[PDB]
Amino acid sequence: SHMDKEGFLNKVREAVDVVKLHIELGHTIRIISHRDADGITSAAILAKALGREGASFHISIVKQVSEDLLRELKDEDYKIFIFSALGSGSLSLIKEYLKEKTVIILDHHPPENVKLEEKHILVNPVQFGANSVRDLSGSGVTYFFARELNEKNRDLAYIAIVGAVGDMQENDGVFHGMNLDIIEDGKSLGILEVKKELRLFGRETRPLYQMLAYATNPEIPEVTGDERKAIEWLKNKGFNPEKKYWELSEEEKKKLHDFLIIHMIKHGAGKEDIDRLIGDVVISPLYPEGDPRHEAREFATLLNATGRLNLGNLGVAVCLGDEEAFRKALKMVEDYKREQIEARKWLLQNWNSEVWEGDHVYVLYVGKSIRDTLVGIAASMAINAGLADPEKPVIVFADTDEDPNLLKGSARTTERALAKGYNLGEALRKAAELVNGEGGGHAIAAGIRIPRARLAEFRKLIDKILGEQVS
Residues that bind Zn ion (CB under 5 A): 38, 85, 137-138, 167, 176
Binding partner selected for residue 176 from Cl ion, Zn ion, none, CB under the kind-specific 5 to 8 Å limit: Zn ion
Binding partner selected for residue 167 from Zn ion, Cl ion, none, CB under the kind-specific 5 to 8 Å limit: Zn ion
**DSSP secondary structure of 229-247:** HHHHHHHHTT--TTSBGGG
Instruction: Output the smallest distance, CB 209 to Zn ion, in A.
Output: 31
Binding partner selected for residue 439 from Cl ion, Zn ion, none, CB under the kind-specific 5 to 8 Å limit: none
Beta carbon nearer to Cl ion, 50 or 136:
136
Residue numbers 358-417 binding Cl ion by CB under 5 A: 376, 410
* # binding residues, Cl ion (CB under 5 A): 3
CA 63 to each of CA 68, 263, 333, 395, 439: distance values in angstroms, whole numbers, following the listed order: 12, 39, 19, 18, 13
Instruction: Output the smallest distance, CB 2 to Zn ion, in A.
Output: 6
Q: What are phi and psi of 80, to 5 degrees?
A: -140, 135
Q: Is 423 in the site for Cl ion (CB under 5 A)?
A: no
445, containing H or E segment? strand 445-451
Beta carbon nearer to Zn ion, 135 or 463:
135
Q: Please state, in angstroms and rounded to a whole number, the distance separating the CA atoms of residues 269 and 122.
A: 42
Beta carbon nearer to Cl ion, 380 or 410:
410
> Cβ(33)–Cβ(39) under 8 Å?
yes
Instruction: Output the smallest distance, CB 178 to Cl ion, in A.
Output: 23
Beta carbon nearer to Cl ion, 30 or 35:
35
Binding partner selected for residue 137 from Zn ion, Cl ion, none, CB under the kind-specific 5 to 8 Å limit: Zn ion
Instruction: Output the smallest distance, CB 34 to Zn ion, in A.
Output: 7
> Cβ(244)–Cβ(290) under 8 Å?
yes
Binding partner selected for residue 295 from Zn ion, Cl ion, none, CB under the kind-specific 5 to 8 Å limit: none
Strands (E) in 284-361, as ranges, are: 356-357
Q: Please state, in angstroms and rounded to a whole number, the distance separating the CA atoms of residues 102 and 121.
A: 8
Beta carbon nearer to Zn ion, 38 or 219:
38
DSSP 331: T
Q: Please state, in angstroms and rounded to a whole number, the distance separating the CA atoms of residues 166 and 37.
A: 5
Binding partner selected for residue 142 from Cl ion, Zn ion, none, CB under the kind-specific 5 to 8 Å limit: none
Instruction: Output the smallest distance, CB 37 to Zn ion, in A.
Output: 9
- Long-range CB contacts (< 8 A, 24+ apart) of 266-275? 267/221, 267/222, 268/221, 269/218, 269/221, 272/172, 272/415, 273/218, 273/219, 274/218, 275/172, 275/173
Binding partner selected for residue 410 from Cl ion, Zn ion, none, CB under the kind-specific 5 to 8 Å limit: Cl ion
Q: Please state, in angstroms and rounded to a whole number, the distance separating the CA atoms of residues 440 and 445.
A: 9
Beta carbon nearer to Cl ion, 185 or 438:
438
Beta carbon nearer to Zn ion, 103 or 126:
126
End-to-end C-alpha distance for the chain, whole angstroms: 20
Count helices and strands (H / E) in the chain. 19, 13
Q: Which of 123, 447, 459, 466 binds Cl ion (CB under 5 A)?
A: 447
Closest to 392 in 3D by CA, of 410, 367, 418: 418
Bridge partner residues of 231 (DSSP): none
Region near Cl ion per CB under 5 A, out of 186-194, 281-289, 440-448, 463-471:
440-448
Region near Cl ion per CB under 5 A, out of 50-58, 188-196, 293-301, 444-452:
444-452
Binding partner selected for residue 89 from Cl ion, Zn ion, none, CB under the kind-specific 5 to 8 Å limit: none
Instruction: Output the smallest distance, CB 384 to Cl ion, in A.
Output: 17
What is the contact surface with Cl ion in residues (CB under 5 A)?
Answer: 376, 410, 447
